[PDB]
């Protein structure tokens with residue numbers, strides 16, 4: 001679909017708050033993902049052995065991974081839909097090296113929404129959440145199309 005500029009501004013205004021502390025937001029988001037959908041943890045060979053939330057919070061590797069993913073997503077969001085160049089390497093690695101189904105991208109999107117709803121009620125009311133959902137749906141739609149071009153059903 002296509003977001004309006006007003007919708008993009010709602011997305012970017014909450015993202016500005018994430019950027020006060022991307023590392024802490026990334027920890028919360030990955031922990032939420034792994035608690036809600038434990039099968040997703042199996043994809044992370046570096047830290048798939050972690051057993052508890054306490055171990056997850058203490059993991060420097062998990063923290064760095066959250067920073068990497070959220071920073072890449074932030075760069076995509078800041079393109080306001082003009083993200084073709086950014087999606088190419090990401091789709092290739094996630095399709096072919098990491099093997100991340102679209103369903104798992106849905107799960108991480110749900111975790112992002114959950115954490116922003118909890119942390120940022122001042123910038124994540126209903127209209128802002130709808131805008132973020134629309135941005136994440138666009139991201140997933142475009143990645144899914146690239147997955148198919150790359151030979152991965154997703």
Ligand code: HEM
Pocket residue numbers: 040041043044045046065068069070072073089090093094098100104105108
């Ligand atoms: C918003 C969605 C996501 C973004 C923006 C994102 C971004 C990234 C980036 C930038 C990297 C490092 C470069 C690369 O390999 O492409 C990475 C690595 C990786 N991603 Fe994602 N990712 C997302 C979702 C996921 C999900 C849902 C999973 C698994 C359920 C996943 C699994 C992995 C794995 C296993 C790696 C390699 C990690 C390592 O080397 O320790 N990603 N991701």
